[PDB]
Amino acid sequence: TRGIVRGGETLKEHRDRLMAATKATGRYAGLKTLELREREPILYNKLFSRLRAGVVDARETAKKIAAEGELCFTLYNAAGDSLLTSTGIIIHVGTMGAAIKYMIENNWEANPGVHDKDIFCNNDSLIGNVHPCDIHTIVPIFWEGELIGWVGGVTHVIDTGTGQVQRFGYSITCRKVGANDTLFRDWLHESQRMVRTTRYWMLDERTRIAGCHMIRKLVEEVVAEEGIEAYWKFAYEAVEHGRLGLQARIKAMTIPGTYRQVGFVDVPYAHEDVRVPSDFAKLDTIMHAPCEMTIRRDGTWRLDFEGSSRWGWHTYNAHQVSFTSGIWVMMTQTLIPSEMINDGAAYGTEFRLPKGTWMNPDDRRVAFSYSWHFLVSAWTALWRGLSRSYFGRGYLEEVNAGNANTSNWLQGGGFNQYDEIHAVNSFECAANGTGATAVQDGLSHAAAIWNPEGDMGDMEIWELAEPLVYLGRQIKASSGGSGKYRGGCGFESLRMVWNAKDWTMFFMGNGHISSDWGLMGGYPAASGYRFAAHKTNLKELIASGAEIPLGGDTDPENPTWDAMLPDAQIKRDKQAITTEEMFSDYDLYLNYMRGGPGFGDPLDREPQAVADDINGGYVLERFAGEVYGVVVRKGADGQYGVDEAGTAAARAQIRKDRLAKSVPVSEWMKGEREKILAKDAGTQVRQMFAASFKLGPRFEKDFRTFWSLPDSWTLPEEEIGVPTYGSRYSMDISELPDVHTVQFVEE
Amino acid sequence: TRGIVRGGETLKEHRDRLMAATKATGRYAGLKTLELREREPILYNKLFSRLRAGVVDARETAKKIAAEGELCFTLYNAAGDSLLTSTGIIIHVGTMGAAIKYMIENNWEANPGVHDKDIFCNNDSLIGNVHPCDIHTIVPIFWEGELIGWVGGVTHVIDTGATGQVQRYSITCRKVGANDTLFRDWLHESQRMVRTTRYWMLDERTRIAGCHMIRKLVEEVVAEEGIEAYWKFAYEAVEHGRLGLQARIKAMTIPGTYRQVGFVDVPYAHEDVRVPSDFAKLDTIMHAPCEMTIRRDGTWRLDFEGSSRWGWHTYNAHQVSFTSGIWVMMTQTLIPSEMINDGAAYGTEFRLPKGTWMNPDDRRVAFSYSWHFLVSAWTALWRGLSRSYFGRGYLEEVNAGNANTSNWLQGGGFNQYDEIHAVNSFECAANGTGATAVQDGLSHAAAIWNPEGDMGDMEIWELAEPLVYLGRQIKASSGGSGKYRGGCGFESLRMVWNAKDWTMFFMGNGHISSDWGLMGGYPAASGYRFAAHKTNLKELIASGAEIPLGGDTDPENPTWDAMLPDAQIKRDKQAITTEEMFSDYDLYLNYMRGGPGFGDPLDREPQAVADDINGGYVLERFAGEVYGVVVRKGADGQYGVDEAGTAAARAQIRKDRLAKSVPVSEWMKGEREKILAKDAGTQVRQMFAASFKLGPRFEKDFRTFWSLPDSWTLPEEEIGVPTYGSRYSMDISELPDVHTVQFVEE
């Protein structure tokens, strides 16, 4: 046959046909009926069971090369659509799927060609990828000379290649790195210069190629026993199957209608401790991620991000592939926790990411090295939206106020206690607080949005990898969102530099803004802040038996460590993002993990839960009365107990104080409107709105209508007084010729 | 014959043999006799003259695929040694040759295999390259299924990427094509490294077109004159070059030891050097001492013991870059021939100590703008070679040295076409040259990496950049004073016009003049910065007020500043900056440096001093203070010489010199007190501290000359500045199963 796909179609003729049938019918590949599944139920169930089991075995067997992370493997059909994904974080199902769809639309079939036993590698920025260090290995599967699918394997390399602002600070575009199952030497020598340490990159490549070739054999054996006729139907029915599964889940758990929510997070690049080389990049900006969620009677739904802010000079921007592919690590935690999850769910979801926004920049200068900062801040709002549907329908067990900001990313560089390059960081922000439920408190220090199987790691293992020692590891008091049910609290650890040389560290996380919100009366989780101490003189303080900082920063409004370090240079502020800073032995670094949002009116919380929280270190005593209205009294055993009568009076008094200090929304609005007309707000607020308007006309109209603003009132970004480089002149990807990108999104 | 090289040897077996014969015999490839040259001279001269011409033809023909000068092509033998090189800048003969020898040593023959019609590409930093944007295309030449040589084509791509870099796009001899056809995944992947696609794509089409033309040339020559004759020429030609350099040294120079040194400043402690790493935020000085030894047999040695350590900046150099590009200056004085090839390398001994900025041996080091250190280190060699010319009697060949190729005008953003900016004006191609022992230096005439200096037309530059010329003027008092004055630089005043999202920065020497005067002459003027933001020039122009024009004639008594009362003027000695925002009607002074002078300025003929004042080469005030010449403004407003007054001023300055000078012994004792008290700037002590550790022989001489006790030490960690990288290295030896080539004693 002429084309290499089974049947004689080229890779592009094949996909274009399926995509045309998908558009005309609304069903993947125009499969109005799934004959294999309906006519042969057992064989269909067996095909998933064996293929799913073999894909997981590849992932776990290949994993056994350590000294799990983003490691994952996915089986695709000829058109680049996922059928099955292994255990692990599934944020790369779409990134690798896009890499296949890039080879399809750019005629890789003709050059460099797609042959059996070829090995392709990819991490391209313009195709779509979460992190530059996330390396894809893609292998085509052939049966009797014809192509029937692809295999994808991905890892997060931890030692690849300060204060990046533009993309031009590596890139692999579906490069053919091997043939005949043998890697090319020029690729091996070249890729080992893209890295500071060789061991991690080399083993990771072996792992990916291993798992891929296992899965390749796994398919060749399934097809041999059950026949190609059966497998060929399954490779397209399984996708249309996933779509029907998502539709059935929506109709069963949620409510049709329109849900509107928004999320924010800060980017404080004006601070002197953010040492970026470009002066046009030094300004305070805020991420704006509004979302209009539409759930329809037919079980389809739509996520429209009209009104979002523009991309900025920083590393927190994202890709439309990165945004849509990675949003399912969140969705599979509430709506579709299923091992059948595949691209079928994608074909049952509509995404609108306006071109030019931070989630769909369409500009080649954009950097995305730390996309998580924005992604986790934008996705959390969707928890709240869905929860409104769960709450109204009665499935309160599924309600969740949202995920915490996966923040304070402890990052360090230099030479460790073995006089060797640092490569492995602690990664304690895998265990943040979780949002509160409509039924119970949230889980403290339990999970991250991109991995619900939160693991905090052992202190004794991290101290074998980092030149740091734990002086404390403690639950972060009052970090969880207050509410009838408290959001999960984060936790903190105090690090002391120990046997480090040429050492540097920086902070990474939300500071001025709490990305998550409480739900239906609950409050947002605590926001971030920084603590670090240099020139502590701790060696002499330890030797002399003086007071030394231990534990966690219990009350940063009334700290106890600072006074213990009189000769120290202490940095204690809300600057939760910094650039590389010099550290040396006996200096201190507070690693503070965020908490989750709360649920419900705080003064509906059962008083004993407040007393249990104070005794447990989840809430500072101070706020027991101010926030929850609970009067607690310390007893003989040192434990706090509830004052039943005193609480009732406090709760009744707060209710009157609320009505007194509050104001009718009509009244407050006209006052806020005067400030809007006078353009009275910080530059970060005005820049956010000014940029959001230009990229979102529908958002500007609603804003003007809601505030009853006259057309005479305008908010041009160019008149705020901050740099605006990149707001009117762009570097589109359309400038690149011979490059055909695929659109997974309305814009 | 299994090995692909002619005869059956593999590439490594072949080179390994030739290199062992070179080490053993002191003659390239163990050629004690050149049979072809001696027994068939006409045929020998014919092969060279014809290959040289065919190579030049390929370079000039391919050049017509755009519209540069760094473009160049080189013909190599099977072992990766240069035979011939096209017209153009020859910095990349060694870099590309090193790429070939990398494929030889790392078994490219077995994987990915070296086949006919294959296309390779390379710019690797660890192999050694001048610039990250200088891209190599390497094609193997075959004859009857066997490899007989290589072709290398290079271009300087202007629109690549990568800020205030402090530590380290790498293409490691990648096979980017087969069957003379490029791979699609390579073409797509390359269009993401560049800002605009045009320049990258035409440059590759240019390199390949030239490589294939040279491949056809060899195939044609071999076919007509026979492969037997060519296979002899392909190695005799190298040894031939070695003998040629030996003859030139013995005919032009003098045996002995020459000692010289050069310096340049890295002022990274200034706030306008926005660097992301705080441990790279300090002031440092480059130290480039050179002990030059010419032996009686005609061999010579270049020992850079005592040089400073690599730093957190983009001015470090690879050993291959330092030795491959040094021949751009050697071909301007010692061996200016079109026959130049690697024979000159096998006739020269280089010692670049490991850890120094020229041989860092650390993977973190960056090399983006290594010219700043190279031009400052090479200028000292002119002076050494000149002492041999001057003693032997070839005063015409003397030259005090090359100016720092500084102020590198760099701009970014969007231009008057609302398109990405990629073409910057290249006025630092026309710096002042060093004065000779016979005549003044040439003003605004050349750079060290290109003697064919061209300034460009202002009208052409304004079609490329969003800038307009408000001035273009000879730089007064930039040339080094002396009996014969060093060449003066020039300066242009630029106004930003129709730019958007525009940024600019300065680049060059500031506190230090790298060049020195010779035998009584003085160094050229050092660098400084002038820029003006928020000028309000639009209204000053409209109202008819004074507007800055021309050049910054006297920065000690400027005229522009008073004209700009509302402007933010940056007028300091910070000649290196990171990108800074610029808007229309802002000003940027592009000041090109001059060259060093020769001889005692007091021995300069007075009428030359008067001509210099009249011509804007020397400011009036220095005619008496420096040259001791009294001038009077004549009727026509021109300056003339006062013979009698000049004779007195010269007689008085001679007494002043003896009165204000002191015996060197008396000065040394006082300067020795300061060394013991460690009374000096941190940039000075860090330089010496780093130099001592890398050069024990240099430290030994320092302590000896100053009679310092062993109790006196200068540890770098006690200076008070960051010392990151001094004690902990990421040596390249770590990288697994990567085999490097040492062209240097380290």
Ligand SMILES: [Mn+2]
């Ligand atoms: Mn990753």
Ligand SMILES: [Mn+2]
């Ligand atoms: Mn170059």
